[PDB]
Amino acid sequence: HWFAQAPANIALIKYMGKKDENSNLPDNSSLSYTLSNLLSSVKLEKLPTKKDIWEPLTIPGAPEFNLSVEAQKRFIDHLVRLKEYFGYVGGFLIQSSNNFPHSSGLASSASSFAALTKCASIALSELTQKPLPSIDEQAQLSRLGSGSSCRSFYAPWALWTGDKVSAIDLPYKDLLHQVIVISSQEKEIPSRVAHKLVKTSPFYETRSERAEANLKLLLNAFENKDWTSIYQICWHEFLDMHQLFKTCEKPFSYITDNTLHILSVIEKFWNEKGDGPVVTMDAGPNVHLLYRSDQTDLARQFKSDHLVGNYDVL
Amino acid sequence: MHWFAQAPANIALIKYMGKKDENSNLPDNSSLSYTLSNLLSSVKLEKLPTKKDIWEPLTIPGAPEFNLSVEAQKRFIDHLVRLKEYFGYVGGFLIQSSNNFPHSSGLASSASSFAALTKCASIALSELTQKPLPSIDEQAQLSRLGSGSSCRSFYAPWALWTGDKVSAIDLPYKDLLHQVIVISSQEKEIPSRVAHKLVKTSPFYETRSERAEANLKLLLNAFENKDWTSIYQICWHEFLDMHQLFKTCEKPFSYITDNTLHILSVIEKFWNEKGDGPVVTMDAGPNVHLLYRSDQTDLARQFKSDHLVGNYDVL
């Protein structure tokens, strides 16, 4: 058997799967923070069969009850893609796992494909006696399965622009990451399906331009040690994306009155303390908080004054 | 052979009330309770040759209790089945549950009973299957499935349940004096479980969780400031809110009676007179709970002497 892990990552500027389906290049650049403590793992074992089998596992290592078709479909196809790259014929039992709380949000997607790419590279390289691809190359490969995952190969910050993904040196490195858990509604639209639906939003056409412009301002804000501007820009950024969800042909939303309540409280907090956490959301209901190394107490204060007894925090 | 475990009862200052999401099973609002470490439920498990469990409640002395309940038994056994399936075990058990508090008192035994069953089954099933024993948090989550209230009994002295997480919260007061004014039940009394269902028809039910959260924020702030007077008032407002739900539903019912009102009124007057008193709460039942600070022993004895003795039974 073979094993490997990869960290999840949270994007300040969203990629959103918006890409040129010709060259497979991203329509706009994306910048993300690597969450080194949240890991996805993948164990691979050969099967006497030529077909792969996917068996997700819970933290302890017991089978996870999961009846997914779409997610499974993509994961298997990526392994097959990798086996083709190495010219390998044979099936593998795939056992993936997360070290984080599970459910209640937490996108495993990116870190899971990164771990699979890493593990299959080790396994396949050994099995076929082929050169093991470099880190940069593995990112490129993982990219083919999950765009977001290519950013999980770099730390602490990853910048994905054009045909290149790499680590980027920015002024804030050891952040405190917390997730405000907002439970999903009855028939929630999957992150990947959201990426397709937003196409009918009148603001979609100009989405990448705004993303690029936001990135330029964001980088400048980092260059100036301007945490307040980082906050405001990332704020506009994720709201921009979510607005796409509610302005398409059949409006939908992850954000609810409950989400708005805590988001509002965070604003009042920033105004009150003159400082606060950087905030962002993905194509889901959870709200992510990012605090500086010197904000541990402020973080504890906000949590005690506004999160305790109202929201679950991861 | 056999396995034995115990769990404490707990009393909520902010009520969960069984108000939960139909699909996620998460509580609509958080809940806060005091762990009553002296009131205990016990569960003994003995393996049976068959595959089916048997429930035989017992009295404090150890003799079979006369109980013809179907609903209570169904829930309790299903919880064991649930636990056995979690461990992947196949086999029946003789379940012997008991409490260290009188039947006549009419105290809710559900919460501590399910916690005890969870703990005992966890031990028993762990050794029988050679699996590791589940952590406290995992056990609480499991117990949560048979009885919402029971997950709070896995922590002390205070437990805060928010979303799918339950934990001990470090609050200023500990070693409280707990007294219960036992008010005899009326014939045809609605069970706690059913009352939680009936309140859906109250016009105030829809907005009940908003008030509970608002009260929780105030209560927590009261604790931080060591403001006992505010804890009293908030808890007062909280339980009266819930009880108003019972009498404003489709078919109004009430555990509170003129007898109850007399003593509640007395407590208020006592508070006005002394400028200090007990924290008071009520569950979906007739009894009235008093909570005093460890430094209020004399005030408590004074109130029991001057207003409880000769009028109400007290535990």
Amino acid at the residue A75: F
What are the strands, taking DSSP E only, across B15-66? 31-47, 54-55
Q: CA-nearest residue of chain A to B87?
A: A62
- Burial group, residue A280, by CB count within 10 angstroms (0-12, 13-18, 19+): buried
- B181's enclosing H/E stretch is strand B177-182
Amino acid at the residue B302: Q
How was this structure determined? It was done by: X-ray
Residue with tokens 């409490």: B99
Using a CB–CB cutoff of 8 Å, tell me whether B298 touches chain A. no
CB atoms within 10 A of CB A194: 22
* C-beta of residue B2 within 8 angstroms of C-beta of residue B46: yes
Q: Token pair for residue A6?
A: 């990869």
* C-beta of residue B245 within 8 angstroms of C-beta of residue B282: no
- B7's enclosing H/E stretch is strand B2-14
Query: Is A309's CB within 8 Å of B220's CB?
Result: yes
CA pair distance A223, A212, nearest whole angstrom: 17
Q: Token pair for residue A126?
A: 């050994």
Strand pairing report for B288-292 and B31-47: unpaired
- B167's enclosing H/E stretch is strand B165-168
* C-beta of residue A74 within 8 angstroms of C-beta of residue A101: no
Interface test with B, best of A59, A178, A181 (most B CBs within 10 A): A181
Question: Comparing C-alpha atoms, which of B151, B153, B147 is closest to residue B163?
Answer: B151
Q: Token pair for residue B204?
A: 């105030």
Helices (DSSP H) in chain B: which residue ranges? 71-87, 110-129, 136-144, 192-198, 208-224, 228-247, 258-274, 297-303
Domains observed in chain A = 1-180 (3.30.230.10), 181-314 (3.30.70.890)
**Residues of chain B with C-beta less than 8 angstroms from the C-beta of A309:** 30, 32, 160, 162, 213, 216-217, 220
Using a CB–CB cutoff of 8 Å, tell me whether A294 touches chain B. no
Resolution (A): 2.3
Three-state SS sequence of chain A? CEEEEEEEEEEEECCCCCECCCCCCECCCEEEEEEEEEEEEEEEEEECCCCCEECCECCCCCECCCCCCHHHHHHHHHHHHHHHHCCCCCEEEEEEEECCCCCCCCCCHHHHHHHHHHHHHHHHHHHHCCCCCCHHHHHHHHHHHCHHHHHHHCCCEEEEECCEEEECCCCCCCCEEEEEECCCCCCCCCHHHHHHHHHHCCCCCCHHHHHHHHHHHHHHHHHCCCHHHHHHHHHHHHHHHHHHHHCCCCCCCCCCHHHHHHHHHHHHHHHHHCCCCEEECCCCCCEEEEECHHHHHHHHHHHHHHHCCCCEEC
- B280's enclosing H/E stretch is strand B279-281
Using a CB–CB cutoff of 8 Å, tell me whether A160 touches chain B. no
Long-range contacts of A52-57 (CB under 8 A, 24+ apart): A52/A76, A52/A79, A52/A80, A52/A91, A52/A92, A52/A93, A52/A94, A53/A91, A53/A92, A53/A93, A53/A94, A54/A94, A54/A96, A55/A93, A55/A94, A55/A95, A56/A95, A56/A96, A56/A97, A57/A95, A57/A96, A57/A97
CA pair distance A199, A16, nearest whole angstrom: 11
CA pair distance B144, B162, nearest whole angstrom: 13
Question: What is the distance of C-alpha B110 from the center of its chain?
Answer: 7
Q: Token pair for residue A109?
A: 């997607």
* C-beta of residue A107 within 8 angstroms of C-beta of residue A51: no
Among the partner residues B32, B162, B216, nearest to A312 by beta-carbon distance: B162
